[PDB]
Amino acid sequence: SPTAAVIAEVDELREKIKGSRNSFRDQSFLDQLAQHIADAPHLGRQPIARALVEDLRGYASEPRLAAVKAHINEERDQHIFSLFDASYFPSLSLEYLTYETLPTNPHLAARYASPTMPVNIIASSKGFQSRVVVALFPENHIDGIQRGDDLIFYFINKFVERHNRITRKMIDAVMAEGSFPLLRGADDRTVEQASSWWVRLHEYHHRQGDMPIPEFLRYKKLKPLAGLEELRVDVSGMLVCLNDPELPADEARLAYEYILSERLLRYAVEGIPRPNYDAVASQLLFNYLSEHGGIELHGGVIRLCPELPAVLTEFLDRIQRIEQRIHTTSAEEVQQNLLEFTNRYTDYDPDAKDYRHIPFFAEIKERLGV
């Protein structure tokens, strides 16, 4: 494969520079890296590799990857190639991938517009093969810059994999029979459609409300608050799927089931030994819905109440009431009120200043190995 030879050349350069991350912005290093890319028989002739070499060679006077980002944002082709520094995606250094785009619903893309690219990875260098790397954000390039119109990529093939490995067996073990009928036996293309709706609604709603990100990002990185923000936007997305009549009814109900099953099950067991940010918020959701009549526990399995849409609306309204006071109080005062809400419905240890998995999901982690 010509692409196979390109990626082989990238993986060898990646191996050569693995011990050199502290030099990734040093011009002596970048000049040498650029030359090695330029001289790579297959990689060096790719248009996107011409762009990266240009950006790297100019980095001492312009610390941006403007030519690379212009190629990517204009979708000149379906190749992504760059030098990365993303602390939460540590496997990424010099990396290359090819992707394929997915069908898009016109109303969804118009009404809930964002620069989001749900794609499948077709081929990729080693860094992009890590299970951790489920997306690619503009600030992940070494220049660390993001613009509101930069494209953001989500690797839907990885979310399909995670759904089939974790969520499906949790649905079987944890939900009352008939809870997610459209998901039952659904093929990978159906899960792919649902997941692509999820990411599109997710990115759109992050930018909405009284404390949108990135504006208030630095107030929403604390574990409980990062999770609660994730949950704000995904509950918004579930409600859009339930309420917006211009979305196709079959696809919308499927996306609803996908987002709800993921937030009620897969995200709820994330993290060992303590829950991660997603799981704290999913456990808040679980306990909130339990105590407010949205779900019921019978024989250890979750029944979705017919009233759930009303309770989800109550929940999102509650979060929005807390955030609305940003107009009369400080960001820090709002944070304390979001933490107080979170802690009412989660297992917070005040001496460790951290959370424990609630017993319901601790038992499921032990039973299912999730």
Binding site for a copy of itself (CB under 8 A): 18-19, 21, 87-88, 90-91, 130, 132, 218, 221-223, 226, 270-274, 276, 299-300, 347, 349, 351-354, 356-357, 359, 362-363, 366
Tokens at residue 49, please? Answer: 């590799």
Q: Decide which of a copy of itself, ligand H4B, none touches 91; Cβ closer than 5 to 8 Å per partner kind.
A: a copy of itself
Q: What are the angstrom distances between the C-alpha of 249 and each of 242, 245, 253, 256, 309?
A: 9, 8, 6, 11, 16
Per partner kind, with CB cut-offs from 5 to 8 A, the member of a copy of itself, ligand H4B, none near residue 223 is: a copy of itself
Please identify, using beta-carbon distances, which residue of 257 and 347 lies nearer to a copy of itself. Answer: 347
Total site size for ligand H4B, rule CB under 6 A? 12
Which of positions 86-145 make contact with ligand H4B (CB under 6 A)? 137
Rank residues 159 and 315 by Cβ distance to a copy of itself and give the closer one.
159
Of ligand H4B, a copy of itself, none, which one sits near residue 130, judging by CB under 5 to 8 A according to partner kind?
A: a copy of itself
251 binds, among ligand H4B, a copy of itself, none (CB under 5 to 8 A by kind): none
Q: Which amino acid is at 7?
A: I
User: Of 55 and 347, which CB lies nearer to a copy of itself in the complex structure?
Assistant: 347
- Is the CB of 192 or the CB of 347 nearer to a copy of itself? 347
Q: How far is the CB of 272 from a copy of itself (least distance, A)?
A: 5
> Which residue, 86 or 152, has its beta carbon nearer to a copy of itself?
86
**Would you say 134 and 159 are in contact if contact means Cβ atoms under 8 Å apart?**
yes
Do β-strands 295-298 and 301-304 pair in parallel, antiparallel, or remain unpaired?
antiparallel
Alpha-carbon distance of 331 to 366, in angstroms, equals 38
Angle at CA 136, nearest 5°, toward 132 and 141?
110
Cis peptide before 248 (omega within 30 of 0): no
* Shortest distance, position 46 Cβ to a copy of itself, whole Å: 26
Which of the listed partners (ligand H4B, a copy of itself, none) does 147 bind, with a CB threshold of 5 to 8 Å by partner kind?
Answer: none
By C-beta, is 25 or 107 nearer to a copy of itself? 25
Binding to ligand H4B (CB under 6 A) within 212-271 occurs at 213, 217, 220-221, 226, 229-230
- Which string of b and e fits 255-284 if b means at least 16 CB within 10 Å? bbbbbbbbbbbbbbbbbeeebbbbbbbbbb
Instruction: Please give the Cα distance from 30 to 53 (Å, whole number).
Output: 9
| Distance separating alpha carbons of residues 170 and 15, to the nearest angstrom | 38
Question: In sequence order, what E strands does 125-202 have?
Answer: 135-136, 152-155
Q: How many angstroms separate the CA atoms of 204 and 284, rounded?
A: 23
Q: After which residues is the chain broken (C to N over 2.5 A)?
A: none
Alpha-carbon span 252 to 243, nearest angstrom = 9
Q: Which does 90 bind (CB under 5 to 8 A by kind): a copy of itself, ligand H4B, none?
A: a copy of itself
- Looking at the Cβ atoms of 186 and 231, the one nearer to ligand H4B is 231
The answer to whether the CB of 97 falls within 8 A of the CB of 125 is yes
Does 152 bind ligand H4B (CB under 6 A)? Our answer is yes
- In angstroms, what is the minimal distance from the CB of 265 to a copy of itself? 18
* Contact set for ligand H4B, span 37-76 (CB under 6 A): none
Choose the one of ligand H4B, a copy of itself, none that binds residue 60, judging by a C-beta under 5 to 8 angstroms depending on kind.
none
- Min dist. Cβ of residue 214 to ligand H4B (A): 7
CB atoms within 10 A of CB 129: 13
- Give the CA distances from residue 162 to residues 132, 231, 267, in Å, rounded to whole numbers and listed in that order: 11, 19, 11
Q: How far is the CB of 176 from ligand H4B (least distance, A)?
A: 30
Give residues in contact with ligand H4B (CB under 6 A).
137, 152, 202-203, 206, 213, 217, 220-221, 226, 229-230
